[PDB]
DNA sequence: GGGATTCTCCAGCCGCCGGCAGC
DNA sequence: GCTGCCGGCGGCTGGAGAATCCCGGT
C-alpha cells in the first residue's frame, strides 16, 4: 500500500482539528463524504477523483464560546438520512441532519468536555460519548433515553479521552489519564434489556423517568500495561490496541494465552502483553491511531506529522512494516486519521487547521 | 452587586440574529427607513397607471406605490402632478387590516393549528 | 488589535432594538401615553359624563348627516387596444376573511366574453358590450369586502368603490395602461344605468463617539422624549440590554452607553423548553404542565415626583428547573414526585461488599456466601439499634430462607447467629426460634 | 514534610456540662 | 418548512416583549401579582363574595377557573387570591410565605371549557365540558381535596347539546334559567329552580336554533328578565325575547360584523346599550332601541377576539381579550377627542389602556367587585396574571 | 543487579516460545476478523441511505459570515455560508461521583495515582508545583521507574538463579520493580517455588465450611475465627466500609447463669429418663459409637459454647443427633474436655442516678484542664482494658472522649456515657446529649423514642435523626452563586435537620495530598472532620457537596458524635420556605474564603 | 526525570463622532449600507 | 419497703424595654 | 435626632430531685 499527497486542505482559522470520521454508512457508490471538526465549526467534505475536495455544508455554534472535537457517523433508521454526532469542551452532544441542514437532536447532562464520540456498529440508535466527567454514556437515539453510566468507585478516576466498539457490537473498553485500560460489556442480559427498554419508553406515557442504569465496575479492569497517560484505543477481534505517551502502540489481550474473552472472570488480574508497534516523537498526548473497516492496515499520525502505516496481517509485531508518509508541510501535530468505507483513501486533520487527502495506489 | 454572577445564557441564540439580520437589511433596502423615513417611516414609490377622463373638464390619475402595503388605489387629480411621486408616512399609520404584509415577523397567530378553538 | 470583538459586542442589541422599534410602532405592547414618566404625552383628561342615553342620538344625528349619496347597474364599451384577440372580461369580488379560511377568498366571476382587435389604431374604426347584473341582495353582500373589476387579453386591476363604499369610478372615457407578466395602454367608457453626545466605551482600551443629532429622540425606538428624565428612564427600562451614565457634557447633557454585563433576561416561559430538543419545543399544541410559581412585581408604588437626583418585587416557588443528581437530565414536574432519587441503599455499594469479600484469600465460600447475604439484608434496612437483632435476624430468615435452603448454608447461617451471640447482639431465645421458623 | 496545609471546610463546635442542683 | 423557523424568531421576539414588559411594568401599574397554574386555564370570573380580615393590610378574593391538561385528571379550581387594600403598605406588600394558594379542586369530566357563577348564589356553578352536557357543581358539597376515583359526579347534569362549546351566562333575575351555546348551531335552556327528581340529569326545557351558523355567546341583558343577546359565527348578533314560543323566530336579527364573532356584553348600568367584538379584530356597540345602526367600531386589535366584559363601577369603561395576547381598556368618554401626533401616534383616544403582560394567548379576563380597577387574566402559557393601571391614568 | 540483563537471556527463549504461539494467536484473530466483517458487510449491503447534496447559499443570510478553505496545491479556494446551530442551554461542571449515604474510610494510597492535568499555561512560569506535589508523594507515582514490566516468570526464573554466588535479591526486585515493593511478596514467592503446593481455599490451617462435604473435626475458636475477625460489631456489617480491622475478637465476659436450668424430659432420647446420663449431667457440671462427622463434631464444639449443659437445645439444633445422643457424645469426648470457666462479677455500686453527678465531675475536669486545647477533639476508638480499669492510661481517656457502649471500660465505666433523659423533643440546650454534640443512641435515650418505631419516621426525638437518616427531599439545580446548587422542595423551620454530609474518610496527611490538587481545582470537597480523620466527598457522597459558601447564609454545619463516629449534620440556620439555595459557611480563614469564595450575592444595605 | 515532567498538550512553541448614523452604520455593515456616507462613521 | 406518682426548684434562655453613647 | 447596645426584666422551658400514695405481708 501507497499513498501520496494529493490534496491539502486548510480551514485556516488557526484553530486545531480533531475527530476526523468518514460516513462508512454511505451504499455503494455514493459520493465520499467524510466529516471534519474545528474550533466552534462543524465541517462535511466531498472527495473525488484525482485528488479534488469538495467543501459541504459547515455548522458553526457561534452562541457561546465553544470548542469541538468529536464526529460520529449514523443513518436514521426511518428515513434514511445520514446523521452526525458532534460534541465539544462545553459537555453538549449535537446531532446534526445535513440533508436537513439543521440540528434536531442534543443531548445535555454530561458532566464535562466530552472526548470521544462513537456509535454502535450494529445498532444505529445506541449512541456512546466519551467525556472528562470521568464516566461514560451511551445514549439513545430513536428515544431522547439515556441508558449507561460506566464509572464511579471502580470506574475510570480521571479523565476518560478514549473507547472503542467490539465488531460484534456487544463490549466496549475505555482508557484514561488514570493509566487504566477497562472493559464493559452489552451481551450482559442486564444491558440488552436496559436497550430493549430504552426504545419501549414514551416520555408522555409514565410519569416516572427512564431508568438509566449506572454501572460503576467493569467486567475487566488493569493498570499495569501503560506508565503514562493512555490515550487512543482500537480493537483486533479479541486481542486489544493501545497507545499511550510512551511513544509506541501496545496489542496485548486480557488473561494468558489460553483464556478467552468470554471466560475472563471479573477478578481477572493478570494481562498478556502480544506485539509492540514502534514511533518517535509521540511526546504529546491526545494523539490517535485509526482503522480501516476491515482492520487490515493500521495508521496514526505524529506530532512532526509524519504518517505510520502498518498492515494487520500475519507480519509479526517486531518486522511488520515501517511506512513513513511525508511530506514538506506536515511540520503540524496530527491529531487523528480516517479511513474511507473500503481503506481506499485516507484523511489526516492537524493542529495548523489543516486536512491532508492520502490516496492508496497498491 | 456582587463580583462575578453566573450569566443567564440569554435566550437571543445567533441562529435567530442572522434571520433578524437579514430581514433587518432587506427590510432597509425595501423601504429605506434608517435612510429616507428617519428610522420612523415607511416610504412609497408611485407612478401613474390609469389616466381617467371625468364627466366635466377634470383628469384624474392613479398612482400605483411599489411596497404594495395595505393602502388601496386612489384616485389624484392631474394638478397634483410630480408632486406625489415620493410619499413618506409614519409606521402606525398604515391600515391596521393588513399591515401585517409588511414583514412576517411583524405579528403571527402563535398557536397557528388548534386542537380545541 | 482587531476590534472585531468590539463590534459583535455593540453590534448584538443594535437589531434587536431596531426591530423592536418596528415592531412596537405598528402594534405596541402597551400605550407609550400611560407611562409615568411620559407625562408630557396624553394631555387629555379623564373629565367626562357623558350619559349613554343621549349618545344614540349624537349617533342619528351624524347618521343622518352622513347619508351622502347612493350608487347609480353599469354598461361599459371598450375602445380598441394600443400597443407600442379576443377579450376576456371577469368580475373579481373579494370576501373577509372567515376563521376557516387561511386568508381572504376570491371570486372571479366572470361576466362574459367578448372579441377585441388585434392592437388596433385610433381613427381605424367606424365597440363590444359588458353589462353587469344586480341579481345580488344586501344580505349576500353583508360577507363580501370590497369589488374590483379584472381584464385580460396582459392582466389589469381597478376596484370600484372604496372602503366605505364609496364611488371611485364615475362616468366617462377612461385610458388605462397594461402591464404584461407610455408602453401597452388600453381605453375604455364606463356609464352608469441642547446637544446630546454618546461615547460607545470598550474596556477602557479605546472607544467610539457619537453625536445624537434629532435631539430628544431614542436612537433605538425613535421615541420623543422630550425631559431628559423621561429619555433617560425609557432609555434605562426599554432599552435595558445598555447600561447608560450621565455625565453633564456643556451642550447640556452627555449619556456614555455600554453593554449591560448581567442583563437576567434569559428565557422567562416554561423553563423546561430549552432543554427540549427542536420540534418540541415551544410546540403549544397543547397544555405543557410546570411546577406553580408566584411573582409580585408592583404592589404599592410611592409615585414620586420628577426627580433628575434619582440618576447618577420578590419571587416564591421555584424558579428555576432542577436535575437529577446522576444523570444531570432536566426534571419533569411529574418526576418530581416522592421519588428523591436517593435513598438508603446503593446498587453500586451492594455490588462493592460482595466483590471485596471473595478478596480474602483465608475464608471458604461456604462463608462467604453467608457474609455477603447478611450484609445485603442488613444494607436493605441500615440497622443501628441493637434491640433490632430479634426482629432483624428473624426478618433476614424470612427474607432469605428460600435462597439459603437453595444454598444449602443452614449450618453456616447458624454459625453466623453463634458469631453474633458471642457479640452479645443476640439472646439464646431468638437462634432456636429463627431456626425454627426457617422450616 | 507536610510543610503546607490544605484548605478543609469545618464546623466548630464545643460542649460543657450541666451543674447538678444545690 | 419555514413556519418553524418564524414561529421559533416569534417566540424569541415575544420572550424579549415579555421582558421589557416586566422591566416597564414598574411605571406603568399599582398592582402587579403572577403566578403559572399547574394547567392552563379556559376561564377567568371572581366570586362576588369578600372577606377584609382586620389588622393587616390585604384582603382575600377567590377566582373560579378551570384545568385544561393535555393528559391528566382533570380538575374545577377555585383559588383564593388576597390582595393588597392599603396605599401607603408595600415580602412584595404582606406575608413572605404565599400570595397565591388554591383551596378549591373538584375533579371534571373533561376540558374546563368555561365556567359561570350563578349571582344569586355563588355556590353553585355551571361548566362546559367537550362533550355535548353541562354540569353543575357545588363545591359546599364536595370535598377540597380530589378524589382519586376520577370524575366527580355533578349536582346534575344538563343535556340538550351534542357538540362541544362554551357560551354560558346565569339568570341575573331568576335561579336555575340557564341558556349556553355550543357548535350544534342551537342554545337550550334548562329551568333548576327546582327539579328534585332529575337523578342528577335536566333536559333542555328550551332549545334555540335561531342561527344557522356555530353559536358560541350568551348573556342576558341585565334590567330584563326576558331579554338576551345571542351571538353565532354566522357573523351576526342576535337579541331573543323569550314567551315569544317560537324557537325558530326571534325579537331581533343584525348583522354585526364581516367576519366569525364571538363575545357579547351587557352593560350592567344602562337599559339599552348591547356592546360586542369580533374576530375582524372590531368590537362594536349597538343601541336595543336601533339594532340596525352601530354606534361606533373600537379598532385597535390585531388578531381575533372572544371576550368582552363591561367594567363595574365604571359604565363608560369597557374591555376586551383576543388572541392577539394583549388586554384592551376602552373608554367611551374619549370617543373623538382631538388628540396631541404623540397621542395620535400612540392609539385612538377611545384606547384606554393595553396589557402586554401576556406571553400567549389569553382565554379568559374578568372585572371584579369588591374592588374597582385590578383586572384578571389567564393566558395559554400557563401565566395568570391580577393587575391594576396606575392611577395617574383615570382621575 | 544483572536482573535485567538474565531477564533478557531468559527471554530470548522465552520470546521464541511466545512467537511460536503469536503466529497462531495472529492467525486465529485474523481469521475471526475476517468472519466479523464479513457478517458486518453483509448486514451494511441491505440499506440504501440518501446521498448528502452540496450547500446552496440559504436565503436565510445574504449578509453573514463565510469560510473560505484554502489548499496548498492549485485547486481553487471554497466559500461556503456558515449555518449557526441552534443555542443549548448548558450545565455547569460536575464530575462523576457515586451515591453515598454512610462515610467511607479510604487506605491511605502511598502512590500518586496519575498525574492531574492542567491549564498548560500557568504551569509554563510555575511549573514547580508539580515537583512540589511529587515532594509530597516523594517521588511515589504510578508507574515510576518500573524497569519495564514482569510477569512473575521472569522475576521467579532470576530469583530462583539468584544463588549464593532470598533477602539480598528480595530487595533488588522490591527496588527494579514496584508492583511488589515489598519483600512479603518476594518471600511468598519463595515459599511457593520451595513448596510447589498450596493448602487450598481454606487457610493454611484448613477450616472447610460446615455444609462443605470436606467436614472436618475443628475447635470452636479455629471454626468462628475468620467471622470473629472479619464481623465488625459497631455499624453491623461484614468488612465494615467504615471500620478498621484492627480491634479484639470476641474473647470476652458473658452471664453464664441465663437460663432456667429446670431438667425436663427432651423427647424419647432425651439426656434426662437415663440413671447414668442424669447422674452426668450434674458431674460434668451404653453409648453407641454413632458416625458423628468432622462438621457435626466442629458445630457442636462450637454450641457447647452458648449452653455448657443445655443438651436439648444443642441437639435440636444437631440434625444427625438426639438428646441422649447428646448426652451420651458428651460422656464420650466432653467428659475429657477443660472444666467450664463460670466467671463472675461483684459490680458494688447500685446508685445508677448518682453516677451522672460524678460523670459530670470527670467532664468538668477535662473541661477545666484541657479546654486550652480543646480544639484537638480526637476520633473516638473503642479502647480495650485487659485488667485495669478506665483510667488515665485508658486509650479514651487519654483521647478526651466518653466511653461508647463498643469500650472494654466496666459495665459501669465512669466514663462511660450514660444517656440523656429528655421526656420530649431534645434538641434543646437543657438535653445532655446537645451540650457536649452527640446524638442519642438508640440504647440509650428511650424515653426520647430514640429506641422507639425504628421502622416508622414518626419519632417526637430531633436528635435521632442522623442516625434514622430521614434527610428531607431536596433538588439539583444551577445555582445563583457559583456552579451547581442544592436548592430545598419543600419549606422547613429554623434549626430543623435537613440532611447528612457524607463522603470518603481519609487521614489528615492523605487529605492534605488531595486538598493539593483541590486547591489548584479552585474547587474543593474537603470537611473537616476531627483531628485524625477527614471527610472527603470528591468522590462519594449526596446532593449536599454542591452547597455554596456564605458569610450570611441560612444553614450551619455541626460536626456531631453519632454512635461513636464523627458525622456531619446540616441544620436551617433560619425558617427556610419552599425554593431557596442553602448556603452555610465553610469556616475558612478570612484570606484563604476571599481567595476561594470570592462571590457574595448581594451588596451591603446601607 | 522523563517519568515525572509536565506532561504537555500540545508542541513546546473613529476620531469623527459624527452621529447617530453609526448605528445605521452598524446594523447593515453589508449588502449595501444606507445613507453612503455611514462609512466615515467607521 | 419499694414503686409508681406527682410536684415544685433550679439554671438557662427569650422577648421586651428603658436608658446611653452618638446625631 | 436615633443607633445600636446593652443590661436588666419579667416571662417562659424544661431538666431533675424530692415529697406523696398504695399495695402486701406481720
Redesign the interface.
Known amino acids: 500500500y501507497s499513498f501520496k499527497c494529493v490534496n491539502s486542505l486548510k480551514e485556516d482559522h488557526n484553530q486545531p482539528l480533531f475527530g476526523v470520521q468518514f460516513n462508512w454508512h454511505s451504499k455503494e457508490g455514493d459520493p465520499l463524504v467524510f466529516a471534519t471538526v474545528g474550533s466552534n465549526r462543524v465541517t462535511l467534505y466531498e472527495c473525488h477523483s484525482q485528488g479534488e475536495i469538495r467543501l459541504l455544508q459547515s455548522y458553526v455554534d457561534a452562541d457561546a464560546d465553544e470548542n469541538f472535537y468529536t464526529c460520529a457517523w449514523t443513518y436514521d433508521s426511518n428515513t434514511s438520512h445520514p446523521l452526525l454526532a458532534v460534541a465539544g469542551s462545553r459537555g453538549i452532544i449535537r446531532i446534526i441532519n445535513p440533508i436537513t441542514m439543521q440540528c434536531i437532536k442534543h443531548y445535555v447532562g454530561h458532566g464535562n468536555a466530552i472526548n470521544e464520540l462513537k456509535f454502535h456498529p450494529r445498532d444505529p440508535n445506541l449512541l456512546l460519548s466519551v467525556s472528562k466527567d470521568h464516566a461514560l454514556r451511551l445514549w439513545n437515539i430513536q428515544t431522547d433515553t439515556l441508558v449507561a453510566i460506566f464509572g464511579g468507585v471502580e470506574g475510570h478516576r480521571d479523565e476518560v479521552l478514549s473507547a472503542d466498539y467490539d465488531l460484534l457490537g456487544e463490549k466496549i473498553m475505555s482508557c484514561g489519564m488514570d493509566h487504566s485500560l477497562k472493559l464493559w460489556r452489552i451481551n450482559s442480559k442486564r444491558m440488552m434489556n436496559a436497550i430493549k427498554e430504552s426504545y419501549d419508553y414514551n416520555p408522555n406515557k409514565t410519569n416516572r423517568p427512564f431508568i438509566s442504569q449506572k454501572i460503576h465496575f467493569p467486567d475487566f479492569s488493569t493498570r499495569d500495561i501503560h506508565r503514562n497517560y493512555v490515550d487512543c484505543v482500537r480493537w483486533l477481534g479479541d486481542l486489544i490496541l493501545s497507545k499511550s505517551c510512551e511513544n509506541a502502540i501496545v496489542c496485548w489481550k486480557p488473561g494468558k494465552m489460553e483464556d478467552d474473552i468470554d471466560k475472563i472472570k471479573p477478578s481477572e488480574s493478570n494481562v498478556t502483553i502480544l506485539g509492540r508497534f514502534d514511533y518517535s516523537q509521540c511526546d504529546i498526548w491526545y494523539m490517535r491511531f485509526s482503522m480501516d473497516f476491515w482492520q487490515k492496515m493500521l495508521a496514526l499520525g505524529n506530532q512532526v506529522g509524519k504518517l505510520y502505516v502498518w498492515d494487520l496481517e500475519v507480519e509479526d509485531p517486531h518486522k511488520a512494516k515501517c511506512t513513513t508518509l511525508t511530506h514538506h508541510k506536515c511540520g503540524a501535530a496530527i491529531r487523528q486519521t480516517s479511513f474511507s468505507r473500503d481503506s481506499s483513501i485516507l484523511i489526516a486533520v492537524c493542529d495548523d487547521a489543516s486536512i491532508w487527502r492520502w490516496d492508496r495506489l497498491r | 452587586r456582587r463580583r462575578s454572577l453566573p450569566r443567564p445564557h440569554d435566550f437571543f441564540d445567533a441562529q435567530t440574529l442572522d434571520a433578524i439580520r437579514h430581514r433587518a437589511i432587506c427590510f432597509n433596502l425595501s423601504a429605506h427607513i434608517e435612510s429616507l423615513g428617519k428610522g420612523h417611516s415607511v416610504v412609497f414609490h408611485s407612478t401613474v397607471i390609469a389616466k381617467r377622463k371625468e364627466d366635466s373638464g377634470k383628469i384624474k390619475l392613479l398612482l400605483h406605490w411599489m411596497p404594495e402595503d395595505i393602502l388601496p388605489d386612489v384616485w389624484v387629480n392631474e394638478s397634483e402632478r410630480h408632486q406625489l411621486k415620493t410619499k413618506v408616512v409614519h409606521l402606525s399609520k398604515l391600515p391596521k387590516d393588513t399591515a401585517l404584509l409588511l414583514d412576517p415577523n411583524i405579528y403571527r397567530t402563535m398557536p397557528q393549528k388548534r386542537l380545541k378553538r | 488589535a482587531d476590534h472585531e470583538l468590539f463590534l459583535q459586542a455593540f453590534e448584538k442589541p443594535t437589531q434587536i432594538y431596531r426591530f423592536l422599534r418596528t415592531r412596537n410602532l405598528i402594534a405596541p405592547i402597551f400605550l407609550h401615553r400611560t407611562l409615568t414618566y411620559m407625562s408630557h404625552r396624553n394631555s387629555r383628561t379623564n373629565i367626562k359624563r357623558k350619559t349613554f342615553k343621549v349618545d344614540d342620538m349624537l349617533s342619528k344625528v351624524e347618521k343622518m348627516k352622513g347619508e351622502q349619496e347612493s350608487h347609480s347597474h353599469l354598461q361599459l364599451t371598450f375602445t380598441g387596444f394600443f400597443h407600442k384577440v379576443t377579450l376576456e372580461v371577469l368580475l373579481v369580488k373579494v370576501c373577509h376573511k372567515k376563521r376557516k379560511d387561511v386568508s381572504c377568498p376570491i371570486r372571479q366571476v366572470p361576466t362574459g366574453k367578448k372579441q377585441v382587435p388585434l392592437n388596433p389604431d385610433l381613427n381605424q374604426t367606424k365597440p363590444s358590450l359588458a353589462v353587469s347584473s344586480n341579481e345580488f341582495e344586501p344580505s349576500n353582500s353583508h360577507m363580501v369586502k370590497s369589488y374590483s373589476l379584472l381584464f385580460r387579453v396582459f392582466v389589469a386591476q381597478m376596484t370600484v368603490f372604496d372602503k366605505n363604499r364609496r364611488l371611485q369610478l364615475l362616468d366617462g372615457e377612461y385610458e388605462v395602461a397594461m402591464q404584461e407578466m407610455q408602453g401597452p395602454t388600453l381605453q375604455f367608457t364606463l356609464r352608469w344605468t441642547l446637544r446630546i453626545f454618546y461615547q460607545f466605551l470598550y474596556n477602557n482600551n479605546t472607544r467610539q463617539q457619537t453625536e445624537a443629532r434629532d435631539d430628544l429622540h431614542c436612537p433605538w425606538c425613535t421615541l420623543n422624549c422630550r425631559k431628559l428624565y423621561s429619555l433617560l428612564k425609557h432609555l434605562k427600562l426599554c432599552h435595558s440590554r445598555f447600561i447608560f451614565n450621565y455625565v453633564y457634557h456643556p451642550k447640556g447633557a452627555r449619556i456614555d452607553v455600554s453593554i449591560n454585563e448581567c442583563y437576567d433576561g434569559s428565557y422567562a416561559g416554561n423553563p423546561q423548553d430549552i432543554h427540549r430538543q427542536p420540534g418540541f419545543a415551544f410546540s403549544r399544541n397543547g397544555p405543557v404542565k410546570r411546577t406553580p410559581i408566584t411573582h409580585i412585581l408592583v404592589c404599592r408604588p410611592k409615585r414620586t415626583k420628577a426627580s433628575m437626583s434619582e440618576f447618577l418585587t420578590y419571587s416564591s416557588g421555584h424558579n428555576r428547573l432542577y436535575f437529577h443528581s446522576d444523570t444531570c437530565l432536566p426534571l419533569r414536574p411529574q418526576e418530581m414526585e416522592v421519588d428523591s432519587e436517593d435513598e438508603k441503599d446503593p446498587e453500586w455499594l451492594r455490588e462493592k461488599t460482595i466483590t471485596q469479600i471473595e478478596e480474602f484469600s483465608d475464608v471458604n465460600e461456604g462463608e462467604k456466601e453467608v457474609m455477603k447475604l447478611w450484609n445485603l439484608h442488613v444494607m436493605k434496612h441500615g440497622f443501628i439499634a441493637d434491640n433490632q437483632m430479634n426482629h432483624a435476624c428473624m426478618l433476614f430468615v424470612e427474607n432469605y430462607g428460600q435462597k439459603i435452603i437453595k444454598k444449602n448454608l443452614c449450618r453456616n447461617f447458624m454459625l453466623h447467629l453463634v458469631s453474633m451471640h458471642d457479640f452479645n447482639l443476640i439472646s439464646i431465645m431468638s437462634i432456636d426460634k429463627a431456626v425454627t421458623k426457617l422450616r | 514534610?507536610?510543610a503546607?496545609?490544605?484548605?478543609?471546610?469545618?464546623?466548630?463546635?464545643?460542649?460543657?456540662?450541666?451543674?447538678?442542683h444545690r | 418548512k419555514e413556519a418553524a423557523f418564524d414561529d421559533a424568531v416569534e417566540e424569541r421576539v415575544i420572550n424579549e416583549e415579555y421582558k421589557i414588559w416586566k422591566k416597564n411594568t414598574p411605571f406603568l401599574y399599582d398592582l402587579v401579582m403572577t403566578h403559572a397554574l399547574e394547567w392552563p386555564s379556559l376561564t377567568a370570573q371572581w366570586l362576588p363574595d369578600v372577606t377584609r380580615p382586620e389588622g393587616k393590610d390585604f384582603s382575600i378574593h377567590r377566582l373560579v377557573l378551570g384545568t385544561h391538561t393535555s393528559d391528566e385528571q382533570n380538575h374545577l379550581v377555585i383559588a383564593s387570591v388576597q390582595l393588597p387594600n392599603d396605599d401607603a403598605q408595600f415580602g412584595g406588600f404582606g406575608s413572605v410565605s404565599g400570595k397565591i394558594e388554591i383551596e378549591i379542586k373538584i375533579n371534571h369530566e373533561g376540558e374546563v371549557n368555561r365556567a359561570r357563577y350563578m349571582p344569586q348564589n355563588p355556590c353553585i356553578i355551571a361548566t362546559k365540558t367537550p362533550s355535548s352536557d353541562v354540569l353543575v357543581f357545588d363545591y359546599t358539597k364536595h370535598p377540597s381535596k380530589p378524589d382519586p376515583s376520577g370524575e366527580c359526579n355533578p349536582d346534575l347534569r344538563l343535556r340538550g347539546h351534542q357538540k362541544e362549546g362554551y357560551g354560558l351566562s346565569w339568570n341575573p333575575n331568576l335561579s336555575g334559567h340557564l341558556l349556553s351555546a355550543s357548535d350544534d348551531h342551537t342554545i337550550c335552556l334548562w329551568d333548576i329552580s327546582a327539579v328534585p327528581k332529575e337523578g342528577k340529569v335536566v333536559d333542555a326545557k328550551t332549545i334555540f336554533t335561531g342561527h344557522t351558523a356555530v353559536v358560541e355567546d350568551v348573556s342576558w341583558h341585565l334590567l330584563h328578565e326576558s331579554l338576551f343577546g345571542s351571538v353565532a359565527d354566522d357573523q351576526k348578533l342576535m337579541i331573543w325575547d323569550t314567551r315569544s314560543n317560537n324557537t325558530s323566530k326571534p325579537s331581533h336579527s343584525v348583522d354585526a360584523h364581516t367576519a366569525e364573532v364571538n363575545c357579547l356584553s351587557f352593560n350592567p348600568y344602562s337599559e339599552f346599550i348591547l356592546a360586542t367584538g369580533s374576530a375582524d379584530k372590531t368590537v362594536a356597540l349597538w343601541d336595543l332601541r336601533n339594532l340596525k345602526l352601530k354606534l361606533h367600531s373600537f379598532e385597535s386589535h390585531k388578531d381575533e377576539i372572544f371576550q368582552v366584559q363591561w367594567s363595574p363601577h365604571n359604565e363608560t369603561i369597557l374591555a376586551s381579550s383576543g388572541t392577539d395576547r394583549r388586554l384592551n381598556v376602552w373608554d367611551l368618554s374619549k370617543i373623538g377627542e382631538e388628540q396631541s401626533p404623540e397621542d395620535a401616534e400612540d392609539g385612538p383616544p377611545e384606547l384606554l389602556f393595553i396589557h402586554g403582560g401576556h406571553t400567549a394567548k389569553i382565554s379568559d379576563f374578568s372585572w371584579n367587585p369588591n374592588e374597582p380597577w385590578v383586572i384578571c387574566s389567564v393566558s395559554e402559557d400557563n401565566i395568570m396574571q391580577v393587575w391594576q393601571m396606575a392611577e395617574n391614568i383615570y382621575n | 543487579k544483572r536482573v535485567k540483563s538474565e531477564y533478557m537471556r531468559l527471554r530470548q527463549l522465552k520470546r521464541f516460545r511466545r512467537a511460536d504461539e503469536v503466529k497462531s494467536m495472529f492467525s486465529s484473530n485474523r481469521q475471526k476478523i475476517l468472519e466479523r466483517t464479513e457478517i458486518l458487510n453483509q448486514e451494511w449491503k441491505q440499506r440504501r441511505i440518501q446521498p448528502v447534496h452540496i450547500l446552496t447559499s440559504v436565503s436565510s443570510l445574504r449578509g453573514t459570515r463565510e469560510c473560505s478553505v484554502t489548499s496548498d496545491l492549485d485547486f481553487p479556494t471554497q466559500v461556503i455560508p456558515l449555518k449557526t446551530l441552534n443555542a443549548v442551554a448548558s450545565v455547569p461542571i460536575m464530575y462523576s461521583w457515586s451515591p453515598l449515604q454512610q462515610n467511607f474510610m479510604v487506605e491511605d494510597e502511598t502512590v500518586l495515582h496519575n498525574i492531574p492535568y492542567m491549564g498548560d499555561e500557568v504551569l509554563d512560569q510555575d511549573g514547580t508545583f508539580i515537583e512540589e506535589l511529587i515532594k509530597n508523594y516523594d517521588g511515589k507515582v504510578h508507574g515510576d521507574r518500573e524497569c519495564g514490566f514482569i510477569n512473575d516468570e521472569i522475576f521467579v526464573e532470576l530469583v530462583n538463579a539468584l544463588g549464593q554466588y532470598s533477602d539480598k535479591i528480595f530487595e533488588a526486585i522490591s527496588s527494579m520493580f514496584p508492583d511488589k515493593g515489598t519483600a512479603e511478596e518476594l518471600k511468598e514467592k519463595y515459599k511457593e517455588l520451595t513448596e510447589q503446593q498450596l493448602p487450598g481455599a481454606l487457610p493454611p490451617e484448613c477450616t472447610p465450611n460446615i455444609d462443605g462435604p470436606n467436614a472436618k473435626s475443628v475447635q470452636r475458636e479455629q471454626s468462628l475465627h475468620s467471622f470473629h475477625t472479619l464481623f465488625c460489631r459497631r455499624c453491623f456489617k461484614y468488612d465494615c466500609f467504615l471500620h478498621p480491622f484492627h480491634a479484639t475478637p470476641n474473647t470476652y465476659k458473658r452471664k453464664n447463669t441465663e437460663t432456667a436450668l429446670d431438667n425436663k424430659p427432651c423427647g424419647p432420647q432425651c439426656y434426662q429418663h437415663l440413671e447414668g446420663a442424669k447422674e452426668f449431667a450434674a458431674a460434668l457440671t451404653p453409648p453407641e459409637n454413632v458416625e458423628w462427622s468432622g462438621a457435626e463434631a466442629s458445630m457442636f464444639r462450637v454450641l457447647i459454647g452458648t449452653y455448657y449443659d443445655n443438651f436439648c437445645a444443642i441437639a435440636r439444633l444437631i440434625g444427625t443427633k438426639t438428646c441422649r445422643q447428646v448426652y451420651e457424645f458428651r460422656v464420650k469426648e466432653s467428659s475429657i474436655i477443660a472444666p467450664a470457666p463460670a466467671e463472675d462479677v461483684d459490680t458494688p455500686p447500685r446508685k445508677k442516678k448518682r453516677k451522672h453527678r460524678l460523670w459530670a465531675a470527670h467532664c468538668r475536669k477535662i473541661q477545666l484542664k484541657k479546654d486550652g486545647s480543646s480544639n484537638h477533639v480526637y476520633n473516638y476508638q473503642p479502647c480495650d482494658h485487659p485488667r485495669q480499669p478506665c483510667d488515665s492510661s485508658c486509650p479514651c481517656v487519654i483521647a478526651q472522649n466518653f466511653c461508647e457502649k463498643f469500650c472494654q471500660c466496666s459495665s459501669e465505666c465512669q466514663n462511660r456515657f450514660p444517656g440523656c433523659r429528655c421526656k420530649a423533643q431534645c434538641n434543646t440546650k437543657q438535653c445532655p446529649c446537645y451540650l457536649a454534640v452527640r446524638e442519642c443512641d438508640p440504647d440509650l435515650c428511650l424515653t426520647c423514642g430514640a429506641a422507639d418505631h425504628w421502622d416508622s419516621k414518626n419519632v417526637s426525638c430531633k436528635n435521632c435523626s442522623i442516625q434514622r437518616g430521614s434527610k428531607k427531599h431536596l433538588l439539583l439545580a444551577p445555582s445563583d452563586v457559583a456552579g451547581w446548587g442544592i436548592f430545598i422542595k419543600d419549606p422547613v423551620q429554623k434549626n430543623e435537620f435537613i440532611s447528612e454530609y457524607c463522603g470518603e474518610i481519609i487521614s489528615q496527611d492523605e487529605a492534605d495530598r488531595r486538598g493539593k490538587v483541590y486547591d489548584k481545582y479552585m474547587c474543593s470537597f474537603l470537611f473537616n472532620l476531627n483531628n485524625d480523620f477527614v471527610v472527603d466527598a470528591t468522590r462519594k457522597g449526596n446532593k449536599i457537596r454542591f452547597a455554596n459558601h456564605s458569610v450570611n447564609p441560612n444553614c450551619y454545619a455541626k460536626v456531631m458524635m453519632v454512635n461513636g463516629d464523627h458525622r456531619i449534620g446540616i441544620f436551617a440556620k433560619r425558617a427556610i420556605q419552599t425554593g431557596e439555595e442553602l448556603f452555610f459557611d465553610y469556616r475558612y480563614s478570612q484570606a484563604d474564603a476571599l481567595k476561594y469564595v470570592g462571590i457574595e450575592r448581594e451588596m451591603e444595605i446601607p | 526525570r522523563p517519568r515525572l515532567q509536565a506532561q504537555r498538550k500540545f508542541a513546546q512553541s473613529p476620531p469623527p463622532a459624527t452621529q447617530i448614523s453609526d448605528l445605521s452604520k452598524r446594523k447593515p455593515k453589508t449588502e449595501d449600507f444606507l445613507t453612503f456616507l455611514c462609512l466615515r462613521g467607521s
Open positions: 514534610q507536610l503546607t496545609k490544605a484548605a478543609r471546610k469545618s464546623a466548630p463546635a464545643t460542649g460543657g456540662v450541666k451543674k447538678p
